[PDB]
Amino acid sequence: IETVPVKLKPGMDGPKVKQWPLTEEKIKALVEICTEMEKEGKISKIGPENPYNTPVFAIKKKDSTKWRKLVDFRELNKRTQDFWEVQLGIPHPAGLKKKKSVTVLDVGDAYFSVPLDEDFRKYTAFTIPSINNETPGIRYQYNVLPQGWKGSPAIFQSSMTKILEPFKKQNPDIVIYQYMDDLYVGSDLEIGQHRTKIEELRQHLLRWGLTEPPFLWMGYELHPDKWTVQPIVLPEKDSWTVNDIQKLVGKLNWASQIYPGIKVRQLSKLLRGTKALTEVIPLTEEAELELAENREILKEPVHGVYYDPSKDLIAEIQKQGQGQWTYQIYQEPFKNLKTGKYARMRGAHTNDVKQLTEAVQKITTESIVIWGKTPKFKLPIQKETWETWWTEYWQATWIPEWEFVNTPPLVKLWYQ
Amino acid sequence: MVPISPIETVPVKLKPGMDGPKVKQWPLTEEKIKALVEICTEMEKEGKISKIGPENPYNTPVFAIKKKDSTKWRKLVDFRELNKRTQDFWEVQLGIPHPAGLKKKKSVTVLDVGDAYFSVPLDEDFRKYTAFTIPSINNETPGIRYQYNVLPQGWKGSPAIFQSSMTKILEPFAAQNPDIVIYQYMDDLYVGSDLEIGQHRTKIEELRQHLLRWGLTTPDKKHQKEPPFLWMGYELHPDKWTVQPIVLPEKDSWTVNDIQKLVGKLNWASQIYPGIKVRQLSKLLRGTKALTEVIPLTEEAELELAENREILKEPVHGVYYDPSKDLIAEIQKQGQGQWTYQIYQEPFKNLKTGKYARMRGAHTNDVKQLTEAVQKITTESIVIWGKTPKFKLPIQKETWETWWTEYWQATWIPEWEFVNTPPLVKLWYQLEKEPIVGAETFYVDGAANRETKLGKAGYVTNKGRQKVVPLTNTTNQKTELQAIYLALQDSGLEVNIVTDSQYALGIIQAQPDKSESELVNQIIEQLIKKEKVYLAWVPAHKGIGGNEQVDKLVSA
């Protein structure tokens, strides 16, 4: 019934972020959604004495056909006091990533039952804009804990604990983890049963429900031991052309920045002449051993690679063509903590930006499961193209950080 | 007495830590003080200000300014200090409507609520902070002290508090009149409807009544300003819009601030006047802010102007928006990184027009530029009409497909069609994905001495063809490009080229069609002539030979 004292950090003000342009149909959706939250007390109109703004928009979650309000709280989150007071944190469950299966559940509606600090409310301010600036923006602040705010899970943590203990002690093999508006449920079971254990975990939340949520009935399916980092692999051929050997030496030289004793002297030897690129070169005996050796070296781990929860995760993405995308997550260049590929990206066979947007979501999800935090993306796209279109294809209730690559990597190949 | 509803007050506060103002009252003439005392009496007699005791330690200076040939003073309070100490307010007037966004209505009425501005009370706890002093004649009595009971002219909060208050009052009227539109812009109200002008002046009358409930009246003599309304540099007519007259200074000498006027006014015109160009004119404002420097024109800037004045010669009109008709956007390539566009619903009737200029870069291509102009027009259109237009673009379906599928970045343009209006955006060359069978292999290398700027560029080929050219006034980067240029110059129509230059790959893999580097352009011009080029990269200093048999010849 009673709130929790929340503040900003030292000398930082509340967010003052420009609201970006919205289509008429997303404006209509937000007018209907916000008009109802107001009747239910979740939000209240505000006057011009509140100078704070956070951007707002409307998505359709995976398989639904009803609009959802998404608030881009990235700026409030950066500025929101770290919640270490009682607990040093949620010591990330290293077990979650080993489970055969992990189901992701939107428990976001839970938060709207808990009220917000009275003092803090002004910082949750957002604007439903009007077309052509014809009417002033419809201005609102939160009364209850908002979806997408970092404080929402931290405040609700105690409440979430007391809703879970029955199930967690009923099923002690199940791993359960909360990031933002999302609950992540892992097990070592077969699917039919897993699907059962999920449906059961809804009957708990529906029971604490009365004491119809709109997006609480949905379930996403991962396989984090059916994930794989990727070895570097070299071709196996009977016939090498000069071109084939130039590309091998290129990839081995690149690989040499990651791995110690990768040698190219004996294969480079083969490339000394001014030969036609399509001409076949028999490998020498030293060249065949150097190649065999390099293979051996690539079938091992990278040496001295560790996670560091003090440092940023960085995620790089290359467009490989034909709907295929490569990625790598690191903190130190050449120390990859995860690498990956995506070939099948959904129903976007002629839309590069929809594909990049799905890849960023999938990479961000993997990142939540492994380290319980989102990485900083380096997107192979112009800022203005990305900032025009990403919100049309976005389905998640979190939003990571990103920057733009403007110079084409040579490396794309070395992962092709 | 008919009970008028009071206007609920907006809680106001000073910045966190900052206190109110204490500025010395300026010494005034006897003439001026008399003028103020009369005004401040009439203001006090209306409810707007009030006399305060001496405990109030807050002073905002006051002045009297004479209206041009009006033997009559008006009162000016210099709030510039109190503003700096007043909290921030949400500002919604960042953006103003665009006339092309307006839906045409049979009847539109403009009402200015000129009186109603002071009708809005200030926050009780904040009044004390608005204190000003009328100094007495000869400074022999203590000056008459006053505080505001209403929003002052020239205060930080008055714009924002006025609008929030007008909006709150209008809400029920709009709600219960869906068949009319009211647009609030600063102190004005614009009222439109598709109703017979009987049913319309009726609904206008009701809105005067509804504004009376909060004790606000509007002119009996119906506003002297009638169509065309002159608003924010535009002209609004019943059936069309345009900008207010654009006259270009004819002159003998063109100076600096007289081009920071010719840009702004040519850009303003470009939203309806199709094919304005400002590039050769914005070229002159490069760097130098010496605001009275005569800069000579270029011979490209006198023919771009004889285009401007022939476009500005006869007036052009935009139409208003019809939500039931489709939204089309069409783009033309003008040259020198310049693009022009029209947005329309019906052939030859433009809602509006505009231009896009190439972003500052070393290297560029036409398809990237077209992509950027599409995104500019997409966002602009979302702002004005709440939707993306269908595009008509001078690029073939097959060109675009080759481009996006082979481009290393992710790219997208929304729904569009080819329009065959030269010049067509095209791909000028395409690099092979595989080495070419029976094409000569040129192994190229260049290097320069960091101290002497002396270097060499050349090649050895699989046929024993060779060249080394000595160069002066060069760098490693320039020699690496020149080597590639010599192979292109000296090979047949199909050719394989091996370089160790990460620099040259970087530029060529970005597919420039145009460059500021004259050496990159020459490379582009050879690539255009070739039937097939394959560019292979090998790492340096591995004595990849022809990169070793030519790193030892070019470092000699």
Ligand SMILES: N#Cc1cc(Cl)cc(Oc2c(Br)ccc(CC(=O)Nc3ccc(S(N)(=O)=O)cc3Cl)c2F)c1
């Ligand atoms: N000043 C001003 C102003 C500014 C804006 Cl942004 C809008 C505005 O009124 C409207 C409105 Br409300 C709605 C549509 C338009 C465009 C339009 O239909 N204009 C128009 C429509 C009708 C008449 S009539 N027949 O009453 O003389 C006159 C005009 Cl200028 C308007 F010009 C007036």
